[PDB]
Write a structure and sequence with these properties.
CATH architecture of the largest domain in chain A: Sandwich
CATH topology of the largest domain in chain A: Jelly Rolls
Shape of chain A: globular
Strand order of the largest sheet of chain A: 1-7-2-5
Order of helices and strands of chain A: HEEEEEEEHHEEHHEEHHH
Bound molecules: sodium ion
Distance between the termini of chain A: 20 Å
Structural class of chain A: alpha+beta
CATH class of the largest domain in chain A: Mainly Beta
Protein name (chain B): PrfA
Keywords (chain B): Activator, DNA-binding, Transcription, Transcription regulation
Domain HTH crp-type (chain B): 136-205
GO molecular function (chain B): DNA binding; DNA-binding transcription factor activity
Helix content of chain A: 40-55%
Largest sheet of chain A: 4 strands, antiparallel
Largest interface: A-B, 49 and 47 residues
Number of helices of chain A: 8
InterPro entries (chain B): cNMP-bd_dom_sf (IPR018490), HTH_CRP (IPR012318), RmlC-like_jellyroll (IPR014710), Tscrpt_reg_HTH_Crp-type_CS (IPR018335), WH-like_DNA-bd_sf (IPR036388), WH_DNA-bd_sf (IPR036390)
Oligomer: homodimer
């Protein structure tokens, strides 16, 4: 990712160094009065919110390279009471106090705009998820998640398009599709295996009918086409 | 909104004139090869999309002053097949080609930050809505839409928080039967009341209880407006 590699250079030039986090650590947390800009260079994270009683809500997933800002750029105060949790085994991120970020986006607008554009991708991703859910419900949500996982992590193999993630847990898949409890996911994964859209084998989902997923996640497929044409192009 | 009025002046200083739109017009549409930055100065709009069958979906609502960009700032291509439709009687907007927005935000980083922060409000708004839906379902979504109406248009009165929006506009805010039952249930329970041709919120705490993450979003995003009624 060319724009991401250029942004990594600009940060290191300016003396910001990558940090390594391991699974379950919070890159930023909902109780911290200091807010940050996170350049997630490598790894998979999720955004969570934790209620007073302990219930964890999974709100959004990100993969490196991406940018996540916990505070508004002008006021520097929280945009919501959120954590960024590492769900891959390891992740690498540049962690920038928001006041320090402003100075740096100041003097190089090429990078101001790279971050701007990521927020736009976030916005339209949330709208596409809402639009697919409104039409095809939870079933379409899960198709969407399988679809994007296939675009990003699929390898063509004799068994289908293998979704090549470690510990791709059924529970994590449901959370990414906006569904909390496993009773609903089981139903849907059962139908998808039944109609022979997916298969489970080597700890992995294989996708054997990619067109069926496109069919039920049309607005997320359109988002991927519009926002990630190069990746989309690999399986179209 | 001081930040927004300063942006309006920046636009005009650079020669950009306001355009006027009427209800049901599209300020931008999903078929135009040119994408735009809309500075919606006055009025109420909705973002819409069309499914294969020709069914229209209402995705989001925006009120002046706000910024809505139909294309990515770097590549200038569509963020999604979306239309921006006017819902108030009238709307005033500044309509800027994306390439020209960049040059404009380049010269002035106060206004750069103003626009950037509207994206951030959008992002967080969507997540707050989703969180509320994941706790209380469609009932929470509707409580949350009325909560933001109350904070944005409400004025305290002896009869409660009057919603200072014309009635025709107010009811809309397509025509799902399940939505209409939710609204009328809040009326039945006297959370919002019709009196003397106006609508009054008489139980704000009830709305706050069922749209807690949207209430938090407004506190964090618009603390002064939140504060007026809390
Ligand atoms: Na924080
Ligand atoms: Na357009
Ligand atoms: Na107050």
């Amino acid at each position: 990712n060319a724009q991401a590699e250029e942004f990594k250079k600009y940060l290191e030039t300016n003396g910001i160094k990558p940090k390594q986090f391991h699974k379950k650590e919070l890159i930023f947390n909902q109780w911290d009065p200091q807010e940050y800009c996170i350049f997630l260079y490598d790894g998979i994270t999720k955004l969570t919110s934790i209620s007073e009683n302990g219930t964890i809500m999974n709100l959004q997933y990100y993969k490196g390279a991406f940018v996540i800002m916990s505070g508004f750029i002008d006021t520097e105060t929280s945009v919501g009471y959120y954590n960024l949790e590492v769900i891959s085994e390891q992740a690498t991120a540049y962690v920038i106090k928001i006041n320090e970020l402003k100075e740096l986006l100041s003097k190089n607008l090429t990078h101001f705009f790279y971050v701007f554009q990521t927020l736009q991708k976030q916005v339209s991703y949330s709208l596409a998820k809402f639009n697919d859910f409104s039409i095809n419900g939870k079933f379409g949500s899960i198709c969407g998640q399988l679809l994007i996982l296939t675009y990003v992590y699929g390898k063509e193999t004799p068994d289908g398009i293998k979704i090549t993630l470690d510990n791709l847990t059924m529970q994590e898949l449901g959370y990414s599709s906006g569904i909390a409890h496993s009773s609903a996911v089981s139903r849907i994964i059962s139908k998808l295996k039944q109609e022979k859209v997916i298969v489970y084998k080597n700890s992995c989902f294989y996708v054997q009918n990619l067109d069926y997923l496109k069919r039920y996640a049309p607005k997320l497929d359109e988002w991927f086409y519009l926002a990630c044409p190069a990746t989309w192009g690999k399986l179209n």
